[PDB]
């Protein structure tokens, strides 16, 4: 078994699981983390080379699946029940399972406990909170407004979606960008800007710097940002995103997944390694202790990690969010929604005009 996983993951932890596998079965496991892994893989796999197993964010696997580079996996319904049901939707392509879910990642509400010991449960509370904090030379909320990945949780809350997902597939013509729910959510966001509670220019670095210096009470960000907050000594918490019109915010969900090279002659070995060695409490812990996985798809071990409320928050927002579609038409979604939000928030277009142009 040759395994590819990215350098920022717990690859030495993964190699320890590989050593236990070799100890029980005699099969050597070699874990590599080449640069630009996600680019090399489809090049060597078309040859018939590459690793037996590749670890990556689920949305990349749709391209690999379209090219026929990933084997269909065959987990029992008993095994599938060990993982949170929603994660199995992330690893489907044309209705077929093509990868094992490993870990779960999504935006959360990050708040400064010294400024705001009890963070709001609803988006509708934030204007009055901002007026209060402005009087103290602070602000209520700052987060990246430039990229739709960061603004979508609010836009989707009341009914927006990228592509309709049913059975195990995406209807690439059922797009939920300009329905009434997405109009409501973007309208509420634009009103936050018009009422000076947020600034249309705010981006990732501006919001990060303000939160980590204590100038704003809340931000919206993912687990990749926590360790900079740890460095800054802000006393922070991480919690479920605010509701909008009583509906949960729906952040996009990324699922670290393990796929099996279609050209591997070791497919039954890869299945045993993943199902019976990695996707166990002891396997995921070995990986996690090296580099934290965040929230994991395996119910039994996530219940342990969620003793950390930050991780429980990540999983809770992920269960309420929207699996990121693994299809190439997402690229048009990103460009279109990006323009829509910029134009609506700057005033060039009305919310209605901007979302209608994006849907087209």
């Amino acid at each position: 078994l040759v395994i590819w996983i990215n350098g920022d993951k717990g690859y030495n932890g993964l190699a320890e699981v590989g050593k236990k596998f070799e100890k029980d079965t005699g099969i050597k496991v070699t874990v590599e983390h080449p640069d630009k892994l996600e680019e090399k893989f489809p090049q060597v796999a078309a040859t018939g080379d590459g690793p037996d197993i590749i670890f990556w964010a689920h949305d990349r696997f749709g391209g690999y699946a379209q090219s026929g580079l990933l084997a269909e996996i065959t987990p029992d319904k008993a095994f599938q029940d060990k993982l949170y049901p929603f994660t199995w939707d992330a690893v489907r392509y044309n209705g077929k399972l093509i990868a094992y879910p490993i870990a779960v990642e999504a935006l959360s509400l990050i708040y400064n406990k010294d400024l705001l010991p009890n963070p709001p449960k609803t988006w509708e509370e934030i204007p009055a909170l901002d007026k209060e904090l402005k009087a103290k030379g602070k602000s209520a909320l700052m987060f990246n407004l430039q990229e739709p990945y960061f603004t979508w949780p609010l836009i989707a809350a009341d009914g927006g979606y990228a592509f309709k997902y049913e059975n195990g597939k995406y209807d690439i013509k059922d797009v939920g960008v300009d329905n009434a729910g997405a109009k409501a959510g973007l309208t509420f966001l634009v009103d936050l800007i018009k009422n000076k509670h947020m600034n249309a220019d705010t981006d990732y670095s501006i919001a990060e710097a303000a939160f980590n210096k204590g100038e704003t009470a809340m931000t919206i960000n993912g687990p990749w940002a926590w360790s900079n907050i740890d460095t800054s000594k802000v006393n922070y918490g991480v919690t479920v995103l605010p509701t909008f019109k009583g509906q949960p915010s729906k952040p996009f969900v990324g699922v670290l997944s393990a796929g099996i090279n279609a050209a591997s002659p070791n497919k039954e070995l890869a299945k045993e390694f993943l199902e019976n060695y990695l996707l166990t409490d002891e396997g995921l812990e070995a990986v996690n202790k090296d580099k934290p996985l965040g929230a994991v798809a395996l119910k039994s071990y996530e219940e342990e990690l969620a003793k950390d409320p930050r991780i429980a928050a990540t999983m809770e927002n992920a269960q309420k969010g929207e699996i990121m579609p693994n299809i190439p038409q997402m690229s048009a979604f990103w460009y279109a929604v990006r323009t829509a939000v910029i134009n609506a928030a700057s005033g060039r277009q009305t919310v209605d005009e901007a979302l209608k142009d994006a849907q087209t």
């Epitope: 350098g7 990229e147 990749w224 360790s227 460095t231 996009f252």
Partner: antibody, heavy 128, light 109 residues
């Protein structure tokens, strides 16, 4: 936030030199460190970079095979090992922090990239 | 795709206090908007002015601005000030082989 280069000096053609960049005031483990050089009277030339979280390194074609960039996260220090130096390598060498975040969606690009903090530079002279 | 040059123009510019100054940079292939602009004065380290083609770095005066048209990037100083005489460099970070433009020296009488 600050970056302090050291290790520069006068070196014979074909010789070696190791530069350091001691950092402080930011989370080193989540940063990228870049070396940029400037030959006398000429423009900036990017030379190498290292990502602390992923360990990945990159090199300019002009130094590939001769330079090695590394970092000790516990010392908050990055290093540039330079070999087979010639007059083409005479320059002030700057280290800089590359700020960015990585897209969570394909193609996982870098966003908001900028070398926001720079050292004072350390001079490398290859004698003639 | 890793092999990207930045062609900056003009190499040198005579300008007066109050002039509008325009510096252009053409990427040899698409770099999306991963372009930054830097200012450097003699004997000193470069300073970041603009990132993501058009975002003003915190604390930089508002007379500096940047824009993108396909593979063409422009740095504009709306009304030049005496502290603005310097060399300016574009930079792309689309390829992991980061590259700088050749620089534009803005020169006083």
């Amino acid at each position: 936030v600050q970056l302090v280069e050291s290790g520069g000096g006068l070196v014979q053609p074909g010789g070696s030199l190791r530069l350091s960049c001691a950092a402080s005031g930011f989370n080193f483990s989540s940063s990228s460190i870049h070396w940029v050089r400037q030959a006398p009277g000429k423009g900036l030339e990017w030379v190498a970079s290292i990502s602390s979280s992923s360990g990945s390194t990159s090199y300019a074609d002009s130094v590939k095979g001769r330079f090695t960039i590394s970092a000790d996260t516990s010392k908050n220090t990055a290093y540039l090992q330079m070999n087979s130096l010639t007059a083409e390598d005479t320059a002030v060498y700057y280290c800089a922090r590359g700020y960015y975040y990585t897209g969570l969606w394909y193609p996982y690009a870098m966003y908001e990239f900028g070398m926001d903090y720079w050292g004072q530079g350390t001079l490398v002279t290859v004698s003639s | 795709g890793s092999d990207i040059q930045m062609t900056q123009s003009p190499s040198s510019l005579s300008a007066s206090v109050g002039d509008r100054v325009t510096i252009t940079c053409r990427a040899s292939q698409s770099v999306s908007s991963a372009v930054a602009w830097y200012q450097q004065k003699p004997g000193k380290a470069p300073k970041l002015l603009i990132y993501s083609a058009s975002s003003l770095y915190s604390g930089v005066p508002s007379r500096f601005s940047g824009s993108r048209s396909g593979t063409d990037f422009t740095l504009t100083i709306s009304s030049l000030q005496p502290e603005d005489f310097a060399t300016y460099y574009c930079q792309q970070s689309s390829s992991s082989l980061i590259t700088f433009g050749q620089g534009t020296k803005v020169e006083i009488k």
